[PDB]
Structures are given as structure tokens and as C-alpha cells.
Coordinates of C-alpha atoms in Angstrom, one line a residue:
Chain H
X1 CA -27.6 -8.2 31.1
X2 CA -30.5 -8.4 28.7
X3 CA -28.6 -10.8 26.4
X4 CA -28.3 -13.3 29.2
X5 CA -32.1 -13.7 28.9
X6 CA -32.4 -12.9 25.2
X7 CA -34.8 -15.3 23.5
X8 CA -32.9 -14.9 20.2
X9 CA -29.6 -16.1 21.7
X10 CA -28.3 -19.6 22.6
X11 CA -25.2 -20.9 24.3
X12 CA -23.0 -19.2 26.9
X13 CA -21.7 -15.6 26.9
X14 CA -18.4 -15.5 25.1
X15 CA -16.2 -12.8 23.5
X16 CA -16.9 -12.1 19.9
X17 CA -13.5 -13.2 18.7
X18 CA -14.0 -16.6 20.3
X19 CA -17.4 -17.1 18.7
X20 CA -16.2 -15.8 15.2
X21 CA -12.4 -16.2 15.1
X22 CA -10.7 -13.8 12.7
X23 CA -7.5 -11.7 12.7
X24 CA -9.1 -8.8 14.6
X25 CA -7.1 -5.9 15.9
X26 CA -6.0 -6.6 19.5
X27 CA -8.9 -6.4 22.0
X28 CA -11.3 -4.9 19.5
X29 CA -13.4 -8.0 19.3
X30 CA -13.3 -9.0 23.0
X31 CA -16.8 -7.6 23.7
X32 CA -19.2 -10.2 25.2
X33 CA -22.0 -11.6 23.0
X34 CA -23.9 -14.9 22.3
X35 CA -24.5 -17.1 19.3
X36 CA -27.7 -16.2 17.4
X37 CA -30.5 -18.7 18.1
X38 CA -33.5 -17.6 15.9
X39 CA -33.1 -16.3 12.3
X40 CA -33.5 -12.6 11.6
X41 CA -36.6 -11.0 13.1
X42 CA -36.3 -8.2 10.5
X43 CA -35.9 -5.3 13.0
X44 CA -36.6 -1.8 11.7
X45 CA -33.6 0.3 10.8
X46 CA -32.2 2.3 13.7
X47 CA -33.2 6.0 13.4
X48 CA -29.5 6.9 14.2
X49 CA -28.2 5.1 11.1
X50 CA -25.1 7.2 10.2
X51 CA -22.8 4.2 10.9
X52 CA -24.7 2.1 8.4
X53 CA -24.8 5.0 5.9
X54 CA -21.0 5.4 6.2
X55 CA -20.4 1.7 5.7
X56 CA -22.9 1.7 2.8
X57 CA -21.2 4.6 1.1
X58 CA -17.8 2.9 1.3
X59 CA -18.8 -0.7 0.6
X60 CA -21.6 0.0 -2.0
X61 CA -23.9 -2.3 0.0
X62 CA -27.4 -1.2 0.8
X63 CA -28.1 -0.3 4.4
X64 CA -31.0 -2.8 4.5
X65 CA -28.6 -5.7 3.5
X66 CA -26.0 -4.5 6.1
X67 CA -28.7 -4.4 8.8
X68 CA -30.1 -7.7 7.8
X69 CA -26.6 -9.3 7.9
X70 CA -26.2 -8.0 11.5
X71 CA -29.5 -9.7 12.5
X72 CA -27.9 -13.1 11.4
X73 CA -24.8 -12.7 13.6
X74 CA -25.9 -10.8 16.7
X75 CA -28.9 -11.3 19.0
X76 CA -31.7 -8.8 19.0
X77 CA -30.7 -7.5 22.5
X78 CA -27.5 -6.2 20.9
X79 CA -29.2 -4.6 17.9
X80 CA -32.1 -2.6 19.3
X81 CA -31.8 -1.4 22.9
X82 CA -31.6 1.8 25.0
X83 CA -28.2 2.7 23.6
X84 CA -29.2 2.0 19.9
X85 CA -32.4 4.1 20.1
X86 CA -30.7 7.0 22.0
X87 CA -27.1 7.0 20.8
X88 CA -27.0 4.8 17.7
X89 CA -24.8 1.9 16.6
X90 CA -21.3 1.3 17.9
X91 CA -17.9 0.3 16.5
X92 CA -18.7 -3.2 17.8
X93 CA -21.4 -3.3 15.1
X94 CA -18.7 -2.2 12.7
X95 CA -16.5 -5.1 13.8
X96 CA -19.4 -7.5 13.3
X97 CA -20.1 -6.0 9.8
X98 CA -16.4 -6.1 9.0
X99 CA -16.4 -9.9 9.8
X100 CA -19.6 -10.3 7.7
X101 CA -18.3 -8.4 4.7
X102 CA -14.6 -9.2 4.9
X103 CA -13.1 -5.7 5.3
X104 CA -11.0 -3.7 7.7
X105 CA -12.2 -0.2 8.6
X106 CA -10.0 2.8 9.6
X107 CA -11.8 5.2 11.9
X108 CA -10.4 8.7 11.9
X109 CA -11.5 9.8 15.4
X110 CA -10.9 13.3 16.9
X111 CA -7.8 11.9 18.6
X112 CA -6.3 9.7 15.8
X113 CA -6.9 6.8 13.4
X114 CA -8.0 3.4 14.8
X115 CA -8.6 0.0 13.2
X116 CA -11.6 -2.3 13.3
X117 CA -12.2 -5.6 11.5
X118 CA -10.2 -8.6 10.4
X119 CA -6.8 -8.0 8.8
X120 CA -6.9 -11.1 6.6
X121 CA -9.1 -9.2 4.1
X122 CA -8.7 -7.1 0.9
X123 CA -11.4 -4.5 1.1
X124 CA -10.5 -1.3 3.1
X125 CA -12.8 1.5 4.1
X126 CA -12.5 4.8 5.8
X127 CA -14.9 6.2 8.5
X128 CA -14.7 9.6 10.2
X129 CA -15.9 9.9 13.8
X130 CA -16.5 13.1 15.8
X131 CA -17.1 13.2 19.5
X132 CA -19.6 16.0 19.1
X133 CA -21.7 15.9 21.2
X134 CA -23.6 14.1 19.8
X135 CA -21.2 11.7 18.1
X136 CA -21.5 11.1 14.3
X137 CA -20.0 8.7 11.8
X138 CA -19.3 9.9 8.3
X139 CA -17.6 8.2 5.3
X140 CA -14.2 9.3 4.1
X141 CA -11.3 10.8 6.0
Chain J
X1 CA 0.0 9.6 -7.5
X2 CA 0.2 9.5 -3.7
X3 CA 0.0 6.6 -1.3
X4 CA -0.1 6.0 2.5
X5 CA 2.1 3.7 4.6
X6 CA 0.8 2.5 7.9
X7 CA 3.8 2.2 10.3
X8 CA 4.0 -0.5 13.0
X9 CA 5.0 1.9 15.8
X10 CA 2.9 1.9 18.9
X11 CA 2.2 4.8 21.3
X12 CA 2.5 4.6 25.1
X13 CA 1.2 7.0 27.7
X14 CA 2.6 7.0 31.2
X15 CA 0.3 7.3 34.2
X16 CA 1.0 7.6 37.9
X17 CA -1.6 5.7 39.8
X18 CA -2.2 4.1 43.3
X19 CA -3.2 0.5 43.9
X20 CA -6.5 1.6 45.4
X21 CA -7.5 3.7 42.4
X22 CA -10.6 2.6 40.6
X23 CA -10.9 2.0 36.9
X24 CA -13.1 5.1 36.5
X25 CA -10.3 7.1 38.2
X26 CA -7.8 5.6 35.7
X27 CA -10.0 6.6 32.8
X28 CA -10.4 10.1 34.0
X29 CA -6.5 10.3 34.1
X30 CA -6.4 9.4 30.4
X31 CA -9.0 12.1 29.7
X32 CA -6.8 14.8 31.3
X33 CA -3.7 13.5 29.5
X34 CA -5.1 12.6 26.0
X35 CA -8.6 14.1 25.8
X36 CA -10.5 10.9 25.4
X37 CA -13.9 10.7 27.1
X38 CA -14.3 7.8 29.6
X39 CA -17.4 6.7 27.7
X40 CA -15.3 5.5 24.7
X41 CA -12.5 4.0 26.8
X42 CA -12.1 0.3 27.3
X43 CA -9.1 -0.9 29.2
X44 CA -7.8 -4.5 29.0
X45 CA -5.2 -6.1 31.2
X46 CA -4.3 -9.8 31.0
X47 CA -6.8 -10.4 28.2
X48 CA -9.8 -9.6 30.4
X49 CA -11.8 -6.4 29.9
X50 CA -11.5 -4.4 33.2
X51 CA -14.7 -3.4 35.0
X52 CA -15.3 0.3 35.9
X53 CA -16.2 -0.5 39.5
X54 CA -13.0 -2.3 40.4
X55 CA -9.6 -1.2 41.6
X56 CA -6.1 -1.9 40.2
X57 CA -5.4 -4.1 43.1
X58 CA -8.4 -6.3 42.2
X59 CA -6.7 -7.1 38.9
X60 CA -3.2 -7.6 40.5
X61 CA -1.8 -4.7 38.5
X62 CA 1.7 -4.2 39.8
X63 CA 4.1 -1.3 39.1
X64 CA 5.3 -0.9 35.4
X65 CA 2.4 -3.1 34.2
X66 CA 1.1 -2.4 30.8
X67 CA -2.6 -1.9 30.0
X68 CA -4.2 -1.8 26.6
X69 CA -6.6 1.0 25.7
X70 CA -9.4 0.3 23.1
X71 CA -11.8 2.9 21.8
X72 CA -15.5 2.0 21.6
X73 CA -17.0 4.8 19.5
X74 CA -20.7 5.2 19.0
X75 CA -23.0 7.8 17.5
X76 CA -24.9 9.6 13.5
Chain W
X1 CA 3.3 3.4 41.5
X2 CA 3.5 4.1 37.7
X3 CA 1.8 2.1 34.9
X4 CA 2.0 2.1 31.2
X5 CA -1.0 2.4 28.8
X6 CA -0.9 1.4 25.1
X7 CA -3.2 3.5 23.0
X8 CA -4.7 2.1 19.8
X9 CA -3.9 5.1 17.6
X10 CA -2.3 4.4 14.2
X11 CA 0.4 6.5 12.5
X12 CA 0.4 7.0 8.7
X13 CA 3.1 8.1 6.3
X14 CA 2.4 9.9 3.1
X15 CA 4.5 9.2 0.0
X16 CA 4.7 10.8 -3.4
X17 CA 5.1 7.9 -5.9
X18 CA 4.6 7.1 -9.6
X19 CA 2.9 3.9 -10.9
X20 CA 6.2 2.7 -12.4
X21 CA 8.2 3.0 -9.1
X22 CA 9.8 -0.1 -7.9
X23 CA 9.3 -1.5 -4.4
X24 CA 13.0 -0.8 -3.7
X25 CA 12.3 2.8 -4.6
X26 CA 9.3 2.9 -2.3
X27 CA 11.4 1.7 0.6
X28 CA 14.0 4.3 -0.3
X29 CA 11.4 7.0 -0.1
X30 CA 10.3 5.7 3.4
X31 CA 14.0 5.9 4.6
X32 CA 14.0 9.6 3.5
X33 CA 10.8 10.3 5.5
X34 CA 11.3 8.2 8.6
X35 CA 14.9 7.0 8.6
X36 CA 14.2 3.2 8.4
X37 CA 16.9 1.3 6.4
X38 CA 15.4 -0.6 3.5
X39 CA 16.9 -3.9 4.8
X40 CA 14.6 -3.9 7.8
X41 CA 11.5 -3.0 5.8
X42 CA 8.7 -5.4 4.9
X43 CA 5.7 -4.0 2.9
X44 CA 2.4 -5.8 2.6
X45 CA -0.5 -5.0 0.4
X46 CA -3.7 -7.1 -0.1
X47 CA -2.3 -9.7 2.3
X48 CA 0.8 -10.5 0.2
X49 CA 4.4 -9.4 0.8
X50 CA 5.7 -7.0 -1.9
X51 CA 8.8 -8.1 -3.8
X52 CA 11.5 -5.5 -4.3
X53 CA 11.9 -6.1 -8.0
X54 CA 8.2 -5.4 -8.8
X55 CA 6.5 -2.1 -9.3
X56 CA 3.4 -0.5 -7.8
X57 CA 1.5 -1.1 -11.0
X58 CA 2.4 -4.9 -10.8
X59 CA 0.4 -5.0 -7.5
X60 CA -2.3 -2.7 -9.0
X61 CA -1.7 -0.2 -6.2
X62 CA -3.9 2.7 -7.1
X63 CA -3.8 6.3 -5.7
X64 CA -4.7 6.8 -2.1
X65 CA -4.0 3.1 -1.4
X66 CA -2.5 2.1 2.0
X67 CA 0.5 -0.2 2.5
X68 CA 1.3 -1.8 5.8
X69 CA 4.9 -1.6 7.0
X70 CA 6.5 -4.3 9.2
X71 CA 10.1 -4.0 10.6
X72 CA 12.4 -7.0 10.4
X73 CA 15.2 -6.2 12.8
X74 CA 18.4 -8.3 13.1
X75 CA 21.3 -8.1 15.5
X76 CA 24.5 -8.7 19.5
Chain F
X1 CA 14.3 -12.2 -0.5
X2 CA 11.0 -13.0 1.3
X3 CA 11.8 -16.7 0.9
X4 CA 15.2 -18.1 2.0
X5 CA 16.4 -20.3 -0.9
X6 CA 17.9 -23.1 1.2
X7 CA 14.5 -23.5 2.9
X8 CA 13.0 -24.9 -0.3
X9 CA 15.4 -27.9 -0.2
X10 CA 16.0 -28.1 3.5
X11 CA 16.2 -31.8 4.7
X12 CA 15.0 -30.7 8.2
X13 CA 11.7 -29.3 6.8
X14 CA 8.6 -30.9 5.3
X15 CA 5.4 -29.6 3.7
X16 CA 4.8 -26.5 1.6
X17 CA 6.3 -23.0 2.1
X18 CA 3.7 -21.2 4.1
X19 CA 3.7 -18.1 6.3
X20 CA 4.6 -18.7 10.0
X21 CA 1.1 -17.6 11.1
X22 CA -0.6 -20.3 9.0
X23 CA 1.6 -23.2 10.2
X24 CA 1.5 -21.9 13.9
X25 CA -1.7 -19.9 14.3
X26 CA -1.7 -17.4 17.1
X27 CA -2.8 -13.8 17.8
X28 CA 0.3 -12.3 16.3
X29 CA 0.5 -8.5 15.6
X30 CA -0.6 -7.9 12.1
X31 CA 1.8 -9.3 9.5
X32 CA 4.6 -9.8 12.0
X33 CA 4.4 -13.6 11.5
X34 CA 3.7 -13.6 7.8
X35 CA 7.3 -14.5 6.9
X36 CA 7.5 -17.7 4.9
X37 CA 8.7 -20.9 6.6
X38 CA 8.2 -24.7 6.7
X39 CA 7.3 -27.2 9.5
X40 CA 10.3 -28.8 11.2
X41 CA 10.6 -32.5 10.4
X42 CA 13.7 -33.9 12.0
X43 CA 14.5 -33.5 15.7
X44 CA 17.0 -31.0 17.0
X45 CA 20.5 -31.4 15.6
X46 CA 21.9 -29.5 18.6
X47 CA 23.4 -26.7 16.5
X48 CA 26.0 -24.5 18.3
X49 CA 24.8 -21.2 19.8
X50 CA 25.3 -18.4 17.3
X51 CA 28.3 -16.1 17.9
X52 CA 26.1 -13.0 17.6
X53 CA 23.5 -14.1 20.3
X54 CA 22.4 -10.8 21.8
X55 CA 18.8 -11.6 21.0
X56 CA 19.1 -14.8 23.1
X57 CA 20.9 -12.8 25.8
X58 CA 18.2 -10.2 25.8
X59 CA 15.3 -12.7 26.0
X60 CA 17.2 -14.7 28.6
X61 CA 17.6 -11.7 30.8
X62 CA 13.9 -10.8 30.6
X63 CA 12.4 -14.4 30.9
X64 CA 15.1 -16.0 33.2
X65 CA 15.4 -18.9 30.6
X66 CA 18.9 -19.9 29.7
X67 CA 20.0 -19.1 26.2
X68 CA 20.8 -22.8 25.7
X69 CA 17.1 -23.7 26.3
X70 CA 15.9 -20.8 24.1
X71 CA 18.2 -22.0 21.3
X72 CA 17.1 -25.6 21.7
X73 CA 13.4 -24.5 21.6
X74 CA 14.0 -22.8 18.2
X75 CA 15.5 -25.9 16.8
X76 CA 12.2 -27.8 17.5
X77 CA 10.0 -25.2 15.7
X78 CA 12.1 -23.9 12.8
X79 CA 14.2 -25.8 10.3
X80 CA 18.0 -25.5 10.3
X81 CA 18.1 -23.4 7.2
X82 CA 16.5 -20.5 9.2
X83 CA 18.7 -21.0 12.3
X84 CA 22.3 -21.0 11.0
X85 CA 22.8 -19.5 7.5
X86 CA 24.7 -16.6 5.9
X87 CA 22.7 -13.9 7.7
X88 CA 23.0 -15.7 11.0
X89 CA 26.8 -15.9 10.8
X90 CA 27.3 -12.2 9.7
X91 CA 24.4 -10.3 11.2
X92 CA 22.9 -12.6 13.8
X93 CA 19.4 -13.4 14.8
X94 CA 16.3 -11.5 13.6
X95 CA 13.0 -10.5 15.2
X96 CA 11.4 -13.4 13.3
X97 CA 13.3 -15.6 15.7
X98 CA 11.9 -13.5 18.5
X99 CA 8.4 -14.2 17.2
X100 CA 9.1 -17.9 17.2
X101 CA 10.5 -17.6 20.8
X102 CA 7.4 -15.6 21.8
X103 CA 5.1 -18.3 20.4
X104 CA 7.1 -21.1 22.2
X105 CA 7.1 -19.4 25.6
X106 CA 3.8 -17.4 25.4
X107 CA 5.0 -13.8 25.7
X108 CA 4.7 -10.6 23.8
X109 CA 7.9 -8.6 23.3
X110 CA 8.0 -4.8 22.9
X111 CA 11.0 -3.8 20.8
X112 CA 12.1 -0.2 21.4
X113 CA 13.9 0.5 18.1
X114 CA 15.6 3.7 17.1
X115 CA 12.3 5.0 15.6
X116 CA 9.7 3.8 18.0
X117 CA 8.3 0.8 19.9
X118 CA 7.2 -2.3 18.0
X119 CA 5.4 -5.4 19.2
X120 CA 6.2 -9.1 18.4
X121 CA 4.5 -12.2 19.7
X122 CA 1.0 -13.5 20.4
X123 CA -1.3 -11.1 22.2
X124 CA -3.2 -13.9 24.0
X125 CA -0.3 -14.1 26.5
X126 CA 0.4 -12.7 30.0
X127 CA 4.2 -12.4 30.2
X128 CA 5.6 -9.1 28.8
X129 CA 9.2 -8.3 28.1
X130 CA 11.1 -5.2 26.8
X131 CA 13.9 -5.4 24.3
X132 CA 15.9 -2.5 22.9
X133 CA 17.2 -2.5 19.3
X134 CA 19.9 -0.2 17.9
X135 CA 20.4 0.1 14.1
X136 CA 24.1 1.0 14.6
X137 CA 25.7 -0.4 12.6
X138 CA 26.3 -3.0 13.8
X139 CA 22.9 -3.8 15.1
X140 CA 22.5 -4.9 18.7
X141 CA 19.7 -6.3 20.9
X142 CA 19.7 -5.4 24.6
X143 CA 17.2 -6.0 27.5
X144 CA 15.1 -3.2 28.8
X145 CA 13.6 0.0 27.3

């Protein structure tokens, strides 16, 4: 994996919920990651930015500040890679954003609602997901 | 006004599988049953995220064992 | 063999309420929609358990807000 | 209620009234362990087994742990005011006791109630049990689906 040799990461590979313990929905934060080593490298915004746009619409937080906050918590190898440039951001980034900004997100997918983000929070947002193809995130329900 | 109430009820799907079936085969069974693409499927048993290239026997998944499905949506 | 898979999908219940409705009244409306006795109902909003003698306005529950339901069953 | 009144002056409890998940942090299902309680201070008083003990019987069948050991385990984690009170004598044990038992023995219980399945107990566990609940009345807990 690229994050095993990521210069901007330090420490062993651990699940996200172990590195940043919150009241996550079960197995939604078990994805492998590493602790950020260097500060933000100020990566350019992903071209496929509809996940950030949907979160920005709901939380009234600018997409630049959302993306900068991700660069403080995740290594660069999990922020700009082959999936990010071709498909866009994932609900794993939503979980990281949810931890950063203390909200729980409800994602109304084509097959039913799902939850991402710590439950020990007050702010609640709604995201709509379509399989497509290609998949798209939109605010609201 | 109008409000929503989120119930605590969970949904289970029954699958008939063989011990030698691979995880990818298990995912394709959930696609035929519920309509979820294998790309956005993440199966967890015993707290460890199961790998696509492994079989149910590799994870010691007996009969009537319960697996947890987690959706990884992208897109835008 | 046969295995069980737990999906992560969430069920919601829609209720027609007024700002002055008591929490007891809210639980009574859930019984009429799902059939859950009010005794075994626990409603949580903004991380705090809602007391029966209070109203939706007391907790500042605006329209389209979501309440979490947890069952407390005894019995054987 | 949301706060058993005898708990506030229970001689077997110390500390403030906090939700169960704050005094015993685990990966509980959301808000299933938010019920208020206090930390047990005194050792077990060896309270008699409740007359309505289907919950202990249901857990005993699934986990092969004698109801006596299950009941003693509860007396180490919960104060007496939440183990033998009015509701215990007339209605029996609750799923909140099941959450405490799940924490003590590291299992997650699926409760097949009359309106759907419901989960109690920490998710960072391996042992899985199935318990059936019937509203009745009277309410009853039974092993299995």
C-alpha cells in the first residue's frame, strides 16, 4: 500500500477508530490509516469535489476549510491518489470530516439510508448518493 | 410541523454459501439479492475487515454465523 | 451452509406533531404507527434523553428534526 | 422516569449519576447504554435470584453460564437499587441488565422483539447470542430467534 511508504505518515497502520476514538457507527471507521506526520501540504482541491460541496452546503463551511482539515488528519496518500482523481472522495473522507467537525451524516443511497460519523454530536446533515454510474453526492434527501 | 424518528430495528439478509466460497462470491450473492454493487461492499466478521481474495473457511465462518455489511460509497 | 448478513440500512418513521406536543403524546403517536408500547420507548435528541412531561418546544425540536428511538424491554 | 429515585441515595453506589456508557465505556449500540446509573461501591450482598428470571435463563442457555453466576456478576457492576426494586418484583429484568451482562461477558445480543430485531452489548466482541422478546402481556424473554 502507498500509505505504508507515505512520507507524510508516521507510526503503524491502525484502523481509524483506534487512532481517533469516537462513537462511530459499527465498522464504519475500521478502515486502515496512519497518523499524519507532516503538516498540511496544501493539496489542490480534487476535481471531483461533490462530496465536499454537499458537506459544505449542509455545514456552511467552505470547501477549502473542509479540505484543509482533511490534510491535518489523513496522510497525503489517502487524499490524492488514483481513486481520488478518477472517482472522487469516499464516505471514509466523510467519516474523517465528521470527526473533525463533530457531526453525524445520513447518506440516502439508492438502497436506503446509512449513517457515518460520531453519534456523540449535535450537528446532523443529510447527503444523497446515487450509484449512477458515475456515482454522485448531493446535499439534502 | 413534521418530524422523523429513527427506529433501532436492524435488517438481516439470509445467504446460502459454501465453506469454499470466496468473499467476492459472497458479495456477488448480496448484489443479486439486494442490488448493491460489490465495489461499495465491505464485509466484517469478528471485527476484522474480510479480504476479497479469501474464502469463508479462511475466516473460520461456521454455519449460522453473522457477518456485518458496511457500505463504502464514493463518487460527484 | 447458511449464513446471516446484517445490512447497515436505517429505517425512519414520519410523525405529524405540533410544537406544544408532550413527549408522552409523541410516544403515543409512535404506538399508532409502529405498535410499540410507550413503556418500552426511549427517545433521545441532541444526546439527551427526552423526559415525558416536556414538550417538543422545550427541547427546541424544529421541523424536519430527527429523534432516535431506543427500546427498553423488560420481562420471564 | 429516566432516573431511578432510590439510586440517588443508594448506599451501595458512589459517585455522580452518569450514563452507563460514561462509567463503563464500550462500543455499545447507539444510546443503548445511555441509561443513568452509578458505580457500585460495596461488594455483592448476594441478593436472591429474581422470581421473574427469564432474562437470566435466556442468557444462560445461550452462553452456558449458570444464572447464579450471571446474577452475581450483575451485583458487582450495578448497585442494588437497580437489581431488586419495584419493577424487578412485578415485571422482572430489563434489557439494560442485558447490556450490563453483555459488557461483563463480552458478547452482543440480538433481541428479536415483536416488531423487529434489536442489538444490545458492545460490538467489539466475538460471542453472539439470540434472545426472543414478546410484549404479551406479560412480557417474556426466551432463547433463540
